[PDB]
Design a protein around this ligand. Structure first.
Ligand code: NA
Ligand code: NA
Length: 156
């Protein structure tokens, strides 16, 4: 039932959060976890995605699920983003792209006559036992949080 196998070490990676604290994926054992990766703080599309998730938090709560947003922006950037938008869930500052690489969301595009890497918008649903049970890659923002919520409800 897993759609992705993560390196065992992934679950113990210390993840720097907005607010200045740290978590690990293992610390989330016992409940569903939505991990949504987005390319950049404070852009039109990534703001829309975050506000969409934020609007649905109570529905995520009803399933005991928690949300984590992830990009490679700094904690400070995350703090500003979260404050400005009123997010009620944490953002991981994956500055070294450790979590991104673990989920294989760093993708390459041949453009400008060179190989350019970047974060591909992607979302994953992690079971209470830490299994990746569903994945969405190259995500289109419109309707995404709704679809993730629906999928969560179906799995839970
Ligand atoms: Na860190
Ligand atoms: Na979990």
């Amino acid at each position: 039932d897993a759609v992705l196998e993560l390196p065992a070490a992934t679950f113990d990676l210390p993840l720097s959060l907005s607010g200045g604290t740290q978590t690990t994926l293992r610390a989330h054992a016992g409940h569903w976890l939505v991990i949504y990766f987005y390319p950049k703080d404070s852009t039109p599309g990534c703001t829309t995605e975050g506000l969409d998730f934020n609007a649905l938090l109570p529905e995520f709560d009803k399933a005991g699920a928690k949300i984590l947003g992830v990009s490679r922006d700094s904690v400070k950037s995350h703090d500003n983003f979260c404050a400005k938008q009123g997010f009620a869930f944490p953002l991981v500052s994956d500055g070294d792209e450790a979590l991104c690489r673990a989920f294989d969301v760093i993708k390459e595009k041949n453009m400008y006559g060179k190989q350019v890497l970047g974060i591909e918008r992607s979302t994953f649903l992690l079971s209470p036992e830490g299994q990746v049970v569903q994945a969405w890659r190259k995500v289109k923002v419109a309707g995404h949080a709704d679809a993730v919520l629906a999928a969560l409800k179906a799995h839970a």
